[PDB]
């Protein structure tokens, strides 16, 4: 189903965004396979411009089109999986993702996700 979310970056993570005029991007995806594992892998390689600061390079391809603000990407790998780097706090709608089921959380249309570095 159609999912439009906000991805906010805090604690210094915003300095690695393509658009440095704001600390967030909007992501649009029309796939039932969207999850935090493929979302973290995609942010790691396409939204965060600096290497090693967001997620480890721990890890098949099933690619899909996504919108990041007004830019289309065709390399969103629904089969990729990545863990958030320790020291990065994840919030969904300002709730700690630990009370949401972390990686098992079903991301929903209009969710506001925040990544806050303590590193």
Automatic annotation (TrEMBL):
- Alphabetical keyword list: Cytoplasm, Isopeptide bond, tRNA processing, Ubl conjugation pathway
Q: What does the UniProt PTM comment say about this protein?
A: C-terminal thiocarboxylation occurs in 2 steps, it is first acyl-adenylated (-COAMP) via the hesA/moeB/thiF part of the MOCS3/UBA4 homolog, then thiocarboxylated (-COSH) via the rhodanese domain of the MOCS3/UBA4 homolog.
Give the location in the cell: Cytoplasm
GO CC field: cytosol
Stretch forming the signal peptide: none
Q: In which pathway does it act?
A: tRNA modification; 5-methoxycarbonylmethyl-2-thiouridine-tRNA biosynthesis
Pfam families named among the record's database cross-references: Urm1
GO terms of biological process kind: protein urmylation; tRNA thio-modification; tRNA wobble uridine modification
**Keyword flag Cytoplasm:** yes
Report if keyword Cytoplasm is assigned: yes
Query: According to its UniProt entry, what is the function of this protein?
Result: Acts as a sulfur carrier required for 2-thiolation of mcm(5)S(2)U at tRNA wobble positions of cytosolic tRNA(Lys), tRNA(Glu) and tRNA(Gln). Serves as sulfur donor in tRNA 2-thiolation reaction by being thiocarboxylated (-COSH) at its C-terminus by the MOCS3/UBA4 homolog. The sulfur is then transferred to tRNA to form 2-thiolation of mcm(5)S(2)U. Also acts as a ubiquitin-like protein (UBL) that is covalently conjugated via an isopeptide bond to lysine residues of target proteins.
Task: Tell me the protein's name.
Answer: Ubiquitin-related modifier 1 homolog
Source organism: Plasmodium yoelii yoelii
